[PDB]
């Protein structure tokens, strides 16, 4: 199917507790493959997936060099943002960056991304055209002007359309056993009496990969969007994910309810019911 490569970066200042902590991770879909932590004993870009371990020492040195240079520019940017937002040097602040690419089943570029946030709010983002910017406010408009003068968008576009898609293709082939395998969900319905007059029906989905899934309950064939309790998809810790959806059903009416499950690993969407 379709795939993505993303790099995530977070810098968190801690005045009076040394320099900002920098943590960056790389993913292909829902698989972590590299990490770098400035608070580690010997900070380096470390492999986290067996299919990336094959990359040579010249590759690890390159990646480590980029991570160290990015931690440094983030430290400079955190100082800049204190000035742009007229803030004191006493508080802790957060800088986040994500960039990457999406490709279709044929490996062609679907779209590219490059976006930043300050203190959890949008700051500046490269538009889908990979040629213009969206600035959240008058402070980000200063960065927009600097980036337009420096033709940053053209540099980003070249990476997102070139190296980003080519290396994502390389990783997908090297990791085809895991990256190109969808694990369908293991599904079941549980019943939990709440009182004499109602019970909970919980529809489970376990052991699936990738994380993307749709779990819904219907009553007499009508979607129960408002009345369904849907937990956020959660990692099991073995690469797979979990999710459940629950509905409160009046005693004896369990057969009016049906659970619907959509997942990439399923050739056709499934329908489940509470069996006993």
């Amino acid at each position: 199917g379709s795939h993505s490569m993303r790099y995530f970066h977070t810098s968190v200042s801690r005045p009076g507790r040394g320099e900002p902590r920098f943590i960056t991770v790389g993913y292909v879909d829902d698989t972590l493959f590299v990490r770098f932590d400035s608070d580690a004993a010997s900070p380096r870009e470390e492999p986290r997936a067996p299919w990336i371990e094959q990359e040579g020492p010249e590759h690890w040195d390159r990646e480590t060099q980029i991570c160290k240079a990015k931690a440094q520019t983030d430290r400079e940017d955190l100082r800049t943002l204190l000035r742009y937002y007229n803030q004191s040097e006493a508080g802790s602040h957060t800088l986040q960056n994500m960039y990457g690419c999406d490709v279709g089943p044929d490996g062609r570029l679907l779209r590219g991304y490059h976006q930043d946030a300050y203190d959890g709010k949008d700051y500046i983002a490269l538009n889908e055209d990979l040629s213009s910017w969206t600035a959240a406010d008058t402070a980000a408009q200063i960065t927009q002007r600097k980036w337009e003068a420096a033709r940053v968008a053209e540099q980003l576009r070249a990476y997102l359309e070139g190296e980003c898609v080519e290396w994502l293709r390389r990783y997908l082939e090297n990791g085809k056993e895991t990256l190109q395998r969808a694990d369908p969900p293991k599904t079941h319905v549980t019943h939990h009496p709440i009182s004499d007059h109602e019970a909970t029906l919980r529809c489970w989905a376990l052991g699936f990969y990738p994380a993307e899934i749709t779990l819904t309950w219907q009553r007499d064939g009508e979607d129960q969007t408002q009345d369904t309790e849907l937990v956020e998809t959660r990692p099991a810790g073995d690469r797979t994910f979990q999710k459940w959806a629950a509905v409160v059903v009046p005693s004896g009416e369990e057969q009016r309810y049906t659970c619907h499950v959509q997942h990439e690993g399923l050739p056709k969407p499934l329908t489940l019911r509470w069996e006993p």
Binding site: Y7, Y99, I124, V152, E163
Partner: peptide, 9 residues
Amino acid sequence: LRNQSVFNF
């Protein structure tokens, strides 16, 4: 593979 480019706000 990371982008080697460096840019400042």
